[model samples]
Target: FVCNTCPEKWINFQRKCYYFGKGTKQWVHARYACDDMEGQLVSIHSPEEQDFLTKHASHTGSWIGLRNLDLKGEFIWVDGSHVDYSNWAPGEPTSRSQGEACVMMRGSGRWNDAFCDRKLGAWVCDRLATCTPPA
Candidate 1:
């Protein structure tokens, strides 16, 4: 029997979970929510993971593990890792004449700069490392 309220989304990948929330929330708010659950925002390290998210997303845009909390315009992952794989859409992240601090996944498997307050779709949450074996 599977646990219905389990936090994990794709069980095969035990370290990650999905948070599908409605409405827009700032990066800090979203981070706070994930942290409240003892987790952080999702981080995509590979194409396969990117594909999975794109396929499962119910809305056109969703949040990922990218943010510019400390240095404005400098995006970084939740784990403090520098962004190495940026799939931002052409002329995107525009920061759009304003200070952009959050990132959203576009339908084309790319990322775009979006206002943190304009919520559109779900977001990903990740669990911290534990001794427990993967499910």
Candidate 2:
């Protein structure tokens, strides 16, 4: 795992490995770090990944594949793709405070918004995937 020796922590799920780096970095910086390794921040597409993140997270609050960099309450994944699946705790991510650009994973594997600069827990990243072209 890339994060094993790096500043980030590695979390494995279904043969795929995710990185959760300590400290808080802006979404752009976080994305860049992942990209530098030909990877990107984890994009949780299934309950399994979400479960892994929640279970492996060192603290109750940890960053994941959600952000609102473009606008308020408009969270999207690292790939600029819409989040089709989400587990938001009740009344979560009110976005009450401005600069709530980061997201956290709760004990129930749900998501909530938090201050991007807040260094509460680790952040997730994943290796990019390659697909065969259609024949």
Per lDDT, the best of the predicted structures is 2
lDDT score of model 2?
0.67
lDDT of 2 by residue, 1-135 (tens): 332222344544555667767666665666677787667777787776677777766564666667886665577887788887778888766734666777767656678787666655456678633333454
The sequence of per-residue lDDT tens digits that candidate 1 reaches over residues 1-135 is 232234444333434555554456666677777787777777777777777777766456677779776646577898788877667788876635486667877666678777677665566676533334346
TM-score of each: 0.72, 0.70
Candidate 2: Cα lDDT at 1: 32
Q: Residue 19's C-alpha lDDT in candidate 2?
A: 74
- Specify the poorest-scoring 10-residue window by lDDT in model 2: 1-10
Candidate 1 all-Cα RMSD: 4.6
User: What C-alpha lDDT, on a 0 to 100 scale, does residue 76 get in candidate 2?
Assistant: 84
Candidate 1: residue 53 lDDT (0-100) = 70
